[PDB]
Automatic annotation (TrEMBL):
List of residues binding Ca(2+): D8, D180
Keyword tags: Calcium, Hydrolase, Metal-binding
Gene3D superfamilies, alphabetized: HAD superfamily/HAD-like, Putative phosphatase, domain 2
Residue stretches in coiled coil: none
Species this chain originates from: Pyrococcus horikoshii (strain ATCC 700860 / DSM 12428 / JCM 9974 / NBRC 100139 / OT-3)
Protein name: Uncharacterized protein
Pfam family, one: Hydrolase
GO molecular function: hydrolase activity; metal ion binding
Length: 230
């Protein structure tokens, strides 16, 4: 039977509008009066980080802090503004203020607690994952929190999923993983025998729906799927 439900963090529990608002505010404080459009800086930042996240997929862990600092250091020299030494601190403060849970997150996490093991599996650094959970107020709704820093590898490396299963004491066959990246999340969890659920809220990933066991537009559907399986 399904005895554990694991969730991805960024893009699965926090709202896209809140993330965009937060990140724009980040670049606004990094720039200040500098004659650079903060929206343009953000777009270029997201460009470079998307390439970096792709290059490290499934590979040994490197601190995300270093990866993101590296990107911002390149951007500061390209455009001529002063590198923000407190970029990590600015990013946390803006995410804490403007970050936002999807409306159903607490309901779903509440409904699953007690009945199942509720865990998180994220590529973020451990201190970053805890700040994410603390800022949004959902830290105590998880029985386990597993990060790439602990496992030593980024998704979809099987080690990060294996560690989360070990923490829960359940077999991959007894676990579900919910995420929004078809290859990193659904593909990775499948290698451990886990049941994969893709979260496609805006229906933008039809091309990848064959890679996943289930596709949902709302986390409240996860409850139906687990019951349907047991
Ligand atoms: Ca994600």
């Amino acid at each position: 039977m399904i005895r554990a439900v694991f969730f991805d963090s960024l893009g699965t529990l926090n709202s896209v509008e809140g993330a965009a608002k937060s990140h724009l505010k980040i670049m606004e404080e990094v720039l200040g009066d500098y004659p650079l459009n903060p929206k343009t800086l953000l777009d270029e930042y997201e460009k470079l980080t998307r390439e970096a996240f792709s290059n490290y997929a499934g590979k040994p862990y490197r601190p995300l802090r270093d990866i993101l600092e590296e990107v911002m250091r390149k951007l500061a020299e390209k455009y001529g503004f002063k590198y923000p030494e407190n970029f990590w601190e600015i990013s946390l403060r803006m995410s804490q203020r403007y970050g936002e849970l999807y409306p159903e997150v607490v309901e779903v996490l509440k409904s699953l607690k007690g009945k199942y093991h509720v865990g998180m599996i994220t590529d973020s650094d451990t201190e970053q994952a805890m700040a994410f959970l603390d800022a949004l107020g959902i830290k105590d709704l998880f029985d386990s929190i597993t990060t790439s820093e602990e496992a030593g590898f980024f998704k979809p490396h099987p080690r990060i999923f294996e560690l989360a299963l070990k923490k829960a004491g359940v077999k991959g066959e007894e676990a579900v993983y919910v995420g929004d990246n078809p290859v990193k999340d659904c593909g990775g969890s499948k290698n451990l025998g886990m049941t994969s659920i893709l979260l496609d809220r805006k229906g933008e990933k039809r091309e990848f729906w064959d890679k996943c066991d289930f596709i949902v537009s709302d986390l409240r559907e996860v409850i139906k799927i687990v019951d349907e399986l047991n």
